[PDB]
Amino acid sequence: LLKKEYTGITYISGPLLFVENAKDLAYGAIVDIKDGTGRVRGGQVIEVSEEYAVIQVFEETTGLDLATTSVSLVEDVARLGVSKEMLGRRFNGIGKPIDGLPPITPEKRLPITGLPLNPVARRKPEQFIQTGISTIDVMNTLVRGQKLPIFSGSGLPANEIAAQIARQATVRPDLSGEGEKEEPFAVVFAAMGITQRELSYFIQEFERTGALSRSVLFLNKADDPTIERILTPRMALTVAEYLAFEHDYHVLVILTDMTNYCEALREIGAAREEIPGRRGYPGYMYTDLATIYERAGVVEGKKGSVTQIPILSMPDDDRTHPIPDLTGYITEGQIQLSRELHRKGIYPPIDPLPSLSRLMNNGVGKGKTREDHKQVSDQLYSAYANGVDIRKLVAIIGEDALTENDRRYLQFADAFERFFINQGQQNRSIEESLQIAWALLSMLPQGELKRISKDHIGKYYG
């Protein structure tokens, strides 16, 4: 393969550089930038005319000039050389191995931007997963092949909940009839602007629990240049689509802190003066978050799956910033860690009223988890919601003026929050979580529980 080298770079500012008299670069191609002291940087063509070509630059732009810096074409579509002997490695945000080991010998060259999966050829995500977190396994059920992120605040423990899920998430065949045959999870752990203090947590967690032999890590630390975050989720999802849909794995993708990704493309989309949505983020960001999140799910006819837990760090911990707003319009569920429950020392500080999982109703119920599962979930939301809006009434009229079957609500609420939500690093199975939910519902009088059918309210109450 020959190598063309264009020169005549007109303009270099910020992320962007130009090259005029350059016509034979494809749109979306990769370039490598070769400065005067002999150092390759990466780049990607984002606009081509017959005159010029605009390149965005992955590494930092210091040290470039205009009488050197040749631009050489590579990979007219952006590819990743994917292999299966790839499940013990670390990588940085371009795919270059950063553990000292040799580069991998590519079985395939997949295109990094993916292709949209065919909505006939999907399969409805059926099979239950359990996480050992009772709020998740009961009220916001995760099923396999599902997008649901974790909305969290500034300084909540979200990395610990994601590592806890990936430590103990197993699929139960005792309740479904599949047969054991137990395949555990490959983990594709993508990370965008983690500092060191969270990276050391995840690496110590994985090397303890024995997961670095099944996980491929795509680390983009926060001192690496801030545009290769645009490649990193696509790297991780191309690897996940490979390992799931062509080798029958059951892949779990942890996409750390999408707020850093979304700021990484606000930066690029405001080097181009592209007209924004709200609070500066560009008009097309929904399509980018869509092209990341919707590369998940199961396939009809295959055994693979991709299950995504993205993480969000909601800026002023609200659901109205454009990043949680759009992220909940794409995916199917979210779980919101609440700041208020965290200050009570409660771990995992989920609160159920602003969290949900849309694929609960597929995978819970008789024959597949237990027949009373969905109604228990309904009644817990009803009772705890009534307890919270009677706390808002305690907040003016004082504790004394509450009657009865009101104080049992008010005691249901905090007994709930400190016996059901609060748990340490323990793994509670679904029988444990359901019998604790019946224990908590036993406090209410039997005639109050109006969303539970009478046979289930008979054979479990008390």
């Binding site: 190598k3 008299n21 032999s213």
Partner: protein, 124 residues
Amino acid sequence: GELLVATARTQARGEVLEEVRRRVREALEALPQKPEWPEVVRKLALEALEALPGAKALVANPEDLPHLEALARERGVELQAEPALRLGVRAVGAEGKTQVENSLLARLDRAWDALSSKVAQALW
């Protein structure tokens, strides 16, 4: 310990391929002593000026500035010597700013990926 075995396997495999590739660079840089090479350098210059229409000049090592000269008069192109460019010859396009390199070193380091898959498959 299974990680230890796996890392031993992957590093020994990688040292095997790097040994293969160093031998390949050795055979490439031992081509230009063996007289089949000026029969070769014209072919890559040929494909270079194929893909680069309007190619203003050719720049090469003076190993084959005396050689290709009569083999490029009919090319209508100017020839010059700027050595340190072994095993190939590159085509300066229209008034600078665009140039096409073809050379055995660059062909190796840009074909090495698909050749690594196929070579590891033929080797193991």
